[PDB]
Amino acid sequence: AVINHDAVPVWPQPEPADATQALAVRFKPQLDVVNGCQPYPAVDPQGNTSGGLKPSQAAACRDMSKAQVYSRSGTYNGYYAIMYSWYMPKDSPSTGIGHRHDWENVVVWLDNAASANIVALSASAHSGYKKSFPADKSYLDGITAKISYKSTWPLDHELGFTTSAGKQQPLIQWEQMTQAARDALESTDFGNANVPFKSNFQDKLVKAFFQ
């Protein structure tokens, strides 16, 4: 069911059970929330999903304890991809009404799962991706990508690359979810927003690729 946005518990970050899961923990990014909502949990292990918040101001989505990040891992064009994604209860822009729900994502591109060298970064912005190829070292704290979440007049929120330090969140990976949670993430209508790591995952990787 769709439940109150504050009734979806944070999904604790489990230990990584295989090499895929360990890689996604290793490359977990930092996020600098410049304005708007903090990230919240979108789904619980029973498959209930967040109702978000009505766009009618971000005081209602500032709870630091609700932090969560998602990932899903795959491959495209012989490259290894880890998509990290954040859900916010609303897009609360600097100007304008905004929307209930927000989903954004970055992709960390590696040469392969063993060498695990970062070759590029992609960050979702409106209907496309910003791309840093080769990955600009100023956007990396070691192997930790530094991402911003910000709205600039007259636009809604977008991700971007930043030199600024950010914060990290407990990571739950698609591969570690219950089936009920995967099913709910596939089927649920998030209105203006769309889960970017459901059955559209490969299509998103194609769009994020650094051609």
Interface with Mg ion includes 156 (CB under 5 A)? yes
User: Biggest alpha carbon distance in the chain?
Assistant: 48
Interface with Mg ion includes 157 (CB under 5 A)? yes
Pick the closer one to Mg ion by CB: 61 or 172. 61
Interface with Mg ion includes 195 (CB under 5 A)? no
Say how many CA atoms lie within 13 Å of 135 toward its Cβ.
27
Count, in order, helices (H) and strands (E) of the chain.
Answer: 3, 12
For 153, phi then psi, to 5°, come to -45, 135
> Residues 65 to 124: which contact Mg ion by CB under 5 A?
91, 102
SS3 19: helix
Find out whether 102 is annotated in a ligand binding site.
yes
Pick the closer one to Mg ion by CB: 157 or 204. 157
Find out whether 91 is annotated in a ligand binding site.
yes
**CA atoms 69, 7, 198, 196: torsion sign:** negative
Find out whether 32 is annotated in a ligand binding site.
no
Pick the closer one to Mg ion by CB: 63 or 203. 63
Least CB distance from residue 155 to Mg ion, whole Å? 9
Tokens of 84: 């990290």
Tokens of 54: 């009505």
Find out whether 5 is annotated in a ligand binding site.
no
What residues make contact with Mg ion under the rule CB under 5 A? 6, 63, 91, 102, 156-157
Annotated binding site for Mg(2+): 6, 91, 102, 104, 157
